[PDB]
Coordinates of N, CA and C and ligand atoms in Angstrom, one line a residue:
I1 N 39.4 -77.6 46.1 CA 40.4 -78.2 44.9 C 39.9 -78.0 43.6
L2 N 38.6 -78.2 43.2 CA 38.1 -78.2 42.0 C 38.1 -76.7 41.6
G3 N 37.8 -75.7 42.4 CA 38.2 -74.2 41.9 C 39.5 -73.9 41.7
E4 N 40.5 -74.2 42.4 CA 41.8 -74.1 42.1 C 42.3 -74.9 40.8
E5 N 41.7 -76.0 40.6 CA 42.1 -76.8 39.1 C 41.4 -75.9 38.0
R6 N 40.4 -75.2 38.2 CA 39.7 -74.6 37.1 C 40.6 -73.2 36.9
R7 N 41.0 -72.7 37.9 CA 41.7 -71.6 37.4 C 43.2 -71.7 37.1
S8 N 43.7 -73.1 37.4 CA 44.9 -73.2 36.9 C 44.6 -73.7 35.3
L9 N 43.5 -74.2 34.9 CA 43.4 -74.4 33.5 C 43.3 -72.8 32.7
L10 N 42.6 -72.0 33.5 CA 42.3 -70.7 32.8 C 43.7 -70.1 32.5
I11 N 44.6 -70.0 33.5 CA 45.9 -69.5 33.1 C 46.6 -70.2 32.1
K12 N 46.4 -71.4 32.0 CA 47.2 -72.2 31.0 C 46.6 -71.8 29.6
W13 N 45.2 -71.9 29.4 CA 44.6 -71.4 28.2 C 44.7 -70.0 27.9
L14 N 44.7 -69.0 28.8 CA 45.1 -67.7 28.7 C 46.5 -67.4 28.0
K15 N 47.3 -68.2 28.7 CA 48.8 -67.9 28.2 C 49.1 -68.5 26.9
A16 N 48.4 -69.7 26.4 CA 48.7 -70.2 24.9 C 47.8 -69.4 24.1
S17 N 46.8 -68.6 24.4 CA 46.0 -68.1 23.4 C 46.5 -66.8 22.8
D18 N 46.5 -66.5 21.4 CA 47.0 -65.4 20.8 C 45.7 -64.4 20.6
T19 N 44.4 -64.8 20.8 CA 43.1 -64.1 20.8 C 42.4 -64.1 22.1
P20 N 41.6 -63.2 22.2 CA 40.6 -63.1 23.3 C 40.0 -64.4 23.5
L21 N 39.7 -64.9 24.8 CA 38.8 -65.9 24.9 C 37.6 -65.5 25.6
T22 N 36.5 -65.7 25.0 CA 35.3 -65.3 25.6 C 34.8 -66.0 27.1
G23 N 34.1 -65.2 27.8 CA 33.6 -66.0 29.1 C 32.8 -67.0 29.0
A24 N 32.0 -67.3 27.6 CA 31.2 -68.1 27.4 C 32.1 -69.4 27.2
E25 N 33.2 -69.1 26.0 CA 33.8 -70.2 25.9 C 34.6 -70.9 27.0
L26 N 35.1 -70.0 28.1 CA 35.9 -70.6 29.1 C 34.8 -71.5 30.2
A27 N 33.6 -70.8 30.2 CA 32.7 -71.4 31.1 C 32.2 -72.7 30.4
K28 N 32.2 -73.0 28.9 CA 32.0 -74.2 28.6 C 33.0 -75.0 28.4
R29 N 34.2 -74.6 28.6 CA 35.3 -75.6 28.6 C 35.4 -76.5 30.2
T30 N 34.8 -75.6 31.2 CA 34.8 -76.0 32.4 C 33.6 -76.3 33.3
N31 N 32.5 -76.3 32.4 CA 31.0 -76.5 32.9 C 30.8 -75.5 34.0
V32 N 31.0 -74.4 34.0 CA 30.6 -73.3 34.7 C 29.8 -72.3 34.1
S33 N 29.1 -71.3 34.8 CA 28.5 -70.2 34.2 C 29.5 -69.0 34.1
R34 N 29.1 -68.0 33.2 CA 29.9 -67.0 32.8 C 30.4 -66.1 34.2
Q35 N 29.2 -66.2 35.1 CA 29.4 -65.4 36.2 C 30.6 -66.1 37.0
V36 N 30.6 -67.4 37.0 CA 31.8 -68.2 37.9 C 33.1 -67.7 37.3
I37 N 32.9 -67.5 35.8 CA 34.5 -67.3 35.2 C 34.8 -65.5 35.5
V38 N 33.7 -65.0 35.7 CA 34.0 -63.6 36.2 C 34.7 -63.5 37.5
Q39 N 34.4 -64.4 38.4 CA 34.8 -64.6 39.8 C 36.0 -65.1 39.7
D40 N 36.4 -66.2 39.2 CA 37.6 -66.7 38.8 C 38.6 -65.7 38.3
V41 N 38.5 -65.1 37.4 CA 39.2 -64.0 36.8 C 39.6 -62.9 37.9
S42 N 38.5 -62.6 38.6 CA 38.5 -61.5 39.6 C 39.8 -62.0 40.7
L43 N 39.9 -63.5 41.2 CA 40.5 -63.9 42.2 C 42.0 -63.9 41.5
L44 N 42.1 -64.1 40.2 CA 43.2 -64.3 39.5 C 43.9 -63.0 39.5
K45 N 43.2 -61.9 39.3 CA 43.7 -60.6 39.2 C 44.3 -60.0 40.7
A46 N 43.6 -60.6 41.6 CA 44.0 -60.3 43.1 C 45.3 -61.0 43.4
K47 N 45.4 -62.0 42.6 CA 46.9 -62.6 42.7 C 47.9 -62.2 41.8
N48 N 47.7 -60.8 41.4 CA 48.5 -60.1 40.4 C 48.6 -60.8 38.9
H49 N 47.9 -61.6 38.6 CA 47.9 -61.9 37.0 C 47.3 -60.7 36.2
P50 N 48.2 -60.4 35.2 CA 47.5 -59.3 34.2 C 46.6 -59.6 33.4
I51 N 45.5 -60.3 33.8 CA 44.3 -60.6 32.9 C 43.5 -59.4 32.6
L52 N 43.1 -59.2 31.6 CA 42.1 -57.9 31.0 C 40.9 -58.6 30.5
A53 N 39.8 -58.1 30.8 CA 38.6 -58.3 30.2 C 38.5 -57.4 29.2
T54 N 38.3 -57.9 27.9 CA 38.1 -57.1 26.9 C 36.5 -57.1 26.3
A55 N 36.2 -56.4 25.2 CA 35.1 -56.5 24.7 C 34.7 -57.8 23.9
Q56 N 35.8 -58.5 23.4 CA 36.1 -59.7 22.7 C 36.2 -60.9 23.7
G57 N 36.6 -60.8 25.0 CA 36.9 -61.7 25.9 C 38.2 -61.5 26.7
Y58 N 38.7 -62.5 27.3 CA 39.9 -62.1 28.4 C 41.3 -62.5 27.7
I59 N 42.1 -61.5 28.0 CA 43.4 -61.8 27.3 C 44.4 -61.9 28.5
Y60 N 45.5 -62.5 28.5 CA 46.7 -62.4 29.3 C 47.8 -61.3 28.7
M61 N 48.2 -60.2 29.4 CA 48.9 -59.2 28.8 C 50.2 -59.6 28.6
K62 N 50.7 -59.6 27.6 CA 52.3 -59.9 27.5 C 53.0 -59.0 26.2
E63 N 54.0 -59.1 25.8 CA 54.8 -57.9 24.9 C 54.8 -58.4 23.5
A64 N 54.9 -57.6 22.5 CA 55.1 -58.0 21.2 C 56.5 -58.1 20.6
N65 N 56.9 -58.8 19.4 CA 57.9 -58.9 19.0 C 58.6 -57.6 18.5
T66 N 57.7 -56.7 18.1 CA 58.3 -55.2 17.7 C 57.4 -54.5 18.9
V67 N 58.1 -53.7 19.3 CA 57.4 -52.6 20.2 C 56.5 -51.5 19.3
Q68 N 55.2 -51.5 19.6 CA 54.3 -50.7 18.8 C 54.2 -49.2 19.0
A69 N 53.8 -48.5 18.0 CA 53.4 -47.0 18.3 C 52.2 -46.9 19.2
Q70 N 52.0 -46.1 19.9 CA 50.8 -45.7 21.0 C 50.6 -44.3 20.8
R71 N 49.4 -43.9 21.0 CA 49.1 -42.4 21.1 C 47.7 -42.4 21.6
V72 N 47.6 -41.2 22.5 CA 46.2 -41.0 23.2 C 45.6 -39.9 22.2
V73 N 44.3 -40.1 22.0 CA 43.5 -39.2 21.0 C 42.3 -38.8 21.4
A74 N 42.3 -37.4 21.3 CA 40.8 -36.9 22.0 C 39.9 -36.9 20.9
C75 N 38.7 -37.3 20.8 CA 37.6 -37.5 20.0 C 36.5 -36.8 20.3
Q76 N 35.7 -36.8 19.2 CA 34.1 -36.3 19.4 C 33.4 -36.6 18.2
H77 N 32.4 -37.4 18.4 CA 31.1 -37.5 17.3 C 29.9 -37.5 17.8
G78 N 28.8 -37.3 17.0 CA 27.7 -37.6 17.1 C 26.9 -38.9 17.8
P79 N 25.8 -39.0 18.2 CA 25.3 -40.1 19.0 C 25.1 -41.2 17.9
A80 N 25.4 -41.1 16.7 CA 24.9 -42.0 15.6 C 26.2 -42.5 14.9
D81 N 27.3 -41.8 15.2 CA 28.5 -42.2 14.5 C 29.4 -43.1 15.0
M82 N 29.4 -43.9 16.1 CA 29.9 -44.6 16.9 C 30.6 -45.7 15.8
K83 N 29.8 -46.4 15.3 CA 30.1 -47.5 14.5 C 31.1 -47.0 13.4
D84 N 30.9 -45.9 12.6 CA 31.7 -45.5 11.8 C 32.9 -44.9 12.1
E85 N 32.9 -44.3 13.2 CA 34.4 -44.0 13.5 C 35.2 -45.4 14.1
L86 N 34.7 -46.3 14.8 CA 35.5 -47.4 15.1 C 36.1 -48.2 14.0
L87 N 35.2 -48.2 12.8 CA 35.5 -49.2 11.5 C 36.5 -48.2 10.9
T88 N 36.7 -47.0 10.8 CA 37.7 -46.2 10.3 C 38.9 -46.6 10.8
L89 N 39.1 -46.6 12.2 CA 40.3 -46.9 12.8 C 40.9 -48.4 12.5
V90 N 39.9 -49.4 12.6 CA 40.4 -50.9 12.3 C 40.7 -51.1 11.1
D91 N 40.0 -50.2 10.0 CA 40.3 -50.4 8.6 C 41.8 -49.8 8.4
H92 N 42.3 -49.2 9.3 CA 43.7 -48.9 8.9 C 44.6 -49.4 9.9
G93 N 44.3 -50.8 10.2 CA 45.3 -51.6 11.0 C 45.5 -51.1 12.5
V94 N 44.7 -50.2 13.1 CA 45.1 -49.8 14.4 C 44.2 -50.5 15.3
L95 N 44.8 -50.8 16.5 CA 44.0 -51.6 17.6 C 43.4 -50.6 18.5
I96 N 42.1 -50.4 18.6 CA 41.6 -49.6 19.7 C 41.6 -50.1 21.0
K97 N 42.7 -49.7 21.7 CA 43.0 -50.4 22.9 C 41.8 -50.1 24.0
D98 N 41.3 -48.8 24.2 CA 40.4 -48.6 25.2 C 39.5 -47.3 24.7
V99 N 38.6 -46.9 25.6 CA 37.7 -45.7 25.3 C 37.7 -45.2 26.7
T100 N 37.8 -43.8 27.0 CA 37.6 -43.2 28.3 C 36.8 -42.2 28.0
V101 N 35.8 -41.9 28.8 CA 34.7 -40.9 29.3 C 34.9 -40.2 30.5
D102 N 34.7 -38.9 30.4 CA 35.0 -38.0 31.8 C 33.6 -37.8 32.1
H103 N 33.2 -38.6 33.2 CA 32.0 -38.6 33.6 C 31.8 -38.0 34.8
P104 N 30.7 -37.0 34.7 CA 30.5 -36.0 35.8 C 30.4 -36.7 37.3
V105 N 30.1 -38.0 37.5 CA 29.8 -38.5 38.7 C 31.0 -39.6 39.0
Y106 N 31.5 -40.5 38.2 CA 32.4 -41.4 38.5 C 33.9 -40.9 38.1
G107 N 34.1 -39.7 37.5 CA 35.5 -39.3 37.0 C 35.6 -40.1 35.7
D108 N 37.0 -40.2 35.3 CA 37.3 -40.9 33.9 C 36.9 -42.4 34.1
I109 N 36.1 -42.8 33.3 CA 35.8 -44.2 33.1 C 36.4 -44.7 32.1
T110 N 37.1 -45.9 32.0 CA 37.8 -46.7 30.8 C 37.4 -47.7 30.5
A111 N 36.9 -48.4 29.5 CA 36.6 -49.6 29.0 C 37.9 -50.1 28.1
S112 N 38.1 -51.5 28.6 CA 39.1 -52.0 27.8 C 38.4 -52.7 26.3
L113 N 38.5 -52.1 25.3 CA 37.8 -52.5 24.2 C 38.6 -53.7 23.3
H114 N 39.9 -53.4 23.1 CA 40.8 -54.1 22.5 C 39.9 -54.5 21.0
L115 N 39.5 -53.6 20.4 CA 38.7 -53.8 19.0 C 40.0 -53.7 17.9
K116 N 39.9 -55.0 17.2 CA 40.8 -55.2 16.1 C 40.5 -55.3 14.9
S117 N 39.2 -55.8 14.7 CA 38.7 -56.3 13.2 C 37.4 -55.6 13.3
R118 N 36.9 -55.7 11.9 CA 35.5 -55.2 11.4 C 34.4 -56.0 12.2
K119 N 34.7 -57.2 12.4 CA 33.8 -58.1 13.0 C 33.7 -57.8 14.5
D120 N 34.8 -57.5 15.2 CA 34.9 -57.1 16.7 C 33.9 -55.7 16.7
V121 N 34.0 -54.8 15.7 CA 33.4 -53.4 15.9 C 32.0 -53.6 15.5
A122 N 31.6 -54.5 14.6 CA 30.2 -54.8 14.4 C 29.6 -55.4 15.7
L123 N 30.0 -56.4 16.0 CA 29.2 -57.3 17.1 C 29.4 -56.3 18.5
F124 N 30.3 -55.5 18.7 CA 30.4 -54.7 19.8 C 29.2 -53.4 19.7
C125 N 29.1 -52.9 18.4 CA 28.2 -51.9 18.3 C 26.8 -52.6 18.3
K126 N 26.5 -53.8 17.9 CA 25.3 -54.2 18.0 C 24.9 -54.8 19.5
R127 N 26.0 -55.2 20.2 CA 25.4 -55.6 21.6 C 25.2 -54.3 22.3
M128 N 26.1 -53.2 22.2 CA 25.8 -52.2 23.0 C 24.4 -51.4 22.7
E129 N 23.7 -51.3 21.6 CA 22.6 -50.8 21.2 C 21.5 -51.8 21.7
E130 N 21.7 -53.0 21.8 CA 20.8 -54.1 22.4 C 20.5 -53.7 23.8
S131 N 21.8 -53.3 24.5 CA 21.6 -53.1 26.0 C 21.3 -51.5 26.2
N132 N 21.5 -50.9 27.2 CA 21.1 -49.6 27.6 C 22.2 -48.8 26.7
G133 N 23.6 -49.0 26.7 CA 24.6 -48.6 25.7 C 24.5 -47.1 26.1
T134 N 25.0 -46.7 27.1 CA 25.0 -45.3 27.6 C 26.3 -44.9 28.1
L135 N 27.4 -45.5 27.7 CA 28.8 -44.8 28.0 C 29.1 -43.8 27.5
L136 N 28.9 -43.5 26.3 CA 29.1 -42.2 25.5 C 27.7 -41.4 25.5
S137 N 27.3 -40.9 26.8 CA 26.0 -40.3 26.8 C 26.0 -38.8 26.3
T138 N 24.9 -38.2 26.4 CA 24.8 -36.9 26.1 C 25.7 -35.9 27.1
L139 N 26.0 -36.6 28.4 CA 26.9 -36.0 29.2 C 28.1 -35.3 28.7
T140 N 28.9 -35.8 27.8 CA 30.1 -35.3 27.3 C 29.8 -34.9 25.9
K141 N 28.8 -34.7 25.3 CA 28.4 -34.3 23.9 C 29.3 -35.0 22.9
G142 N 29.5 -36.4 23.2 CA 30.3 -37.1 22.5 C 31.8 -37.2 22.6
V143 N 32.4 -36.2 23.5 CA 33.9 -36.1 23.6 C 34.2 -37.5 24.5
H144 N 35.4 -38.0 24.0 CA 36.1 -39.0 24.6 C 37.6 -39.2 24.2
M145 N 38.2 -40.0 24.8 CA 39.6 -40.4 24.7 C 39.6 -41.8 24.1
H146 N 40.5 -42.4 23.2 CA 40.9 -43.4 22.9 C 42.6 -43.7 23.0
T147 N 42.9 -44.7 23.5 CA 44.3 -45.1 23.5 C 44.6 -46.1 22.2
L148 N 45.3 -45.6 21.2 CA 45.3 -46.3 19.8 C 46.7 -46.7 19.7
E149 N 46.9 -48.0 19.4 CA 48.1 -48.7 18.8 C 48.4 -49.2 17.5
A150 N 49.4 -48.9 17.0 CA 49.5 -49.3 15.7 C 51.1 -50.0 15.4
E151 N 51.5 -50.5 14.1 CA 52.9 -50.8 13.9 C 53.9 -49.8 13.8
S152 N 53.4 -48.3 13.5 CA 54.3 -47.4 13.3 C 53.7 -46.0 13.5
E153 N 54.1 -44.8 13.7 CA 53.6 -43.5 14.0 C 53.2 -42.9 12.7
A154 N 53.6 -43.5 11.5 CA 53.0 -43.4 10.2 C 51.6 -43.7 10.2
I155 N 51.3 -45.1 10.7 CA 50.1 -45.6 10.5 C 49.0 -44.8 11.6
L156 N 49.4 -44.7 12.5 CA 48.6 -43.8 13.4 C 48.3 -42.4 12.8
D157 N 49.2 -41.7 12.1 CA 49.0 -40.6 11.6 C 47.9 -40.7 10.4
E158 N 47.9 -41.6 9.7 CA 46.9 -41.8 8.7 C 45.7 -42.1 9.1
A159 N 45.6 -42.8 10.3 CA 44.3 -43.2 10.6 C 43.8 -42.0 11.5
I160 N 44.6 -41.2 12.1 CA 44.1 -39.9 12.9 C 43.5 -39.0 11.9
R161 N 44.3 -38.8 10.6 CA 43.9 -37.9 9.7 C 42.7 -38.3 9.0
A162 N 42.4 -39.7 8.8 CA 41.0 -40.1 8.6 C 39.9 -39.7 9.5
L163 N 40.3 -39.8 10.7 CA 39.3 -39.2 11.6 C 38.8 -37.9 11.4
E164 N 40.0 -36.9 11.3 CA 39.6 -35.6 11.2 C 38.8 -35.5 9.9
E165 N 39.1 -36.1 8.8 CA 38.4 -35.7 7.5 C 36.9 -36.1 7.7
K166 N 36.7 -36.9 8.6 CA 35.2 -37.3 8.9 C 34.6 -36.5 10.2
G167 N 35.3 -35.5 10.7 CA 34.9 -34.8 11.8 C 34.7 -35.2 13.0
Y168 N 35.8 -36.4 13.4 CA 35.6 -37.1 14.5 C 36.6 -36.7 15.6
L169 N 37.5 -35.7 15.4 CA 38.6 -35.3 16.1 C 37.9 -34.1 17.1
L170 N 38.4 -34.1 18.4 CA 38.1 -33.1 19.2 C 38.8 -31.8 18.6
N171 N 38.2 -30.7 18.2 CA 38.7 -29.3 17.6 C 39.5 -28.8 18.5
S172 N 40.7 -28.4 18.5 CA 41.3 -27.7 19.1 C 41.0 -26.1 19.2
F173 N 40.6 -25.5 20.3 CA 39.6 -24.4 20.2 C 40.0 -23.4 21.2
Ligands
NIO1 O1 34.2 -44.7 20.5 C1 33.0 -44.7 20.8 O2 32.3 -43.7 20.2 C2 32.4 -45.6 21.9 C3 33.4 -46.5 22.5 C4 32.6 -47.4 23.3 C5 31.4 -47.1 23.8 N1 30.6 -46.1 23.4 C6 31.1 -45.3 22.4
ZN2 ZN1 35.4 -43.3 19.7

């Protein structure tokens, strides 16, 4: 009963929230561990709840008041330019929805980043360097995909052109 009560609260809180809720926050609200929250959300996903774990916390997927522009972008940068690439995108008001790496063993690996602010980017880059941080390894020579989302196609164009000026796009060859 208590586990089902806890998961009912998680759904309520995620539906009411306009921002990601960290596993740590959800764990503190329910007196469990972040690991228990992982298991709760896993069970909810198997019940077809569209809950996504992002780099900033859990979100319940729903639609916006205006339909946003979206684009798949092929990128490439050196092993020290991740923070500058991501900051360039959020500074143009672009949501960095995900990143995909073409891994020789796993195939395409996609992480739901949902980076939106400078603080999102700074905290994510710090946490990845403090861990193993090998999602964008020497395996693809920095080549990777992003799904980007913005209010207009004009805004995506300016952000993508800002990537090219820094040499962060995959050069058609
Ligand atoms: O965009 C990048 O460079 C990136 C994003 C997530 C993880 N590693 C690299
Ligand atoms: Zn990138």
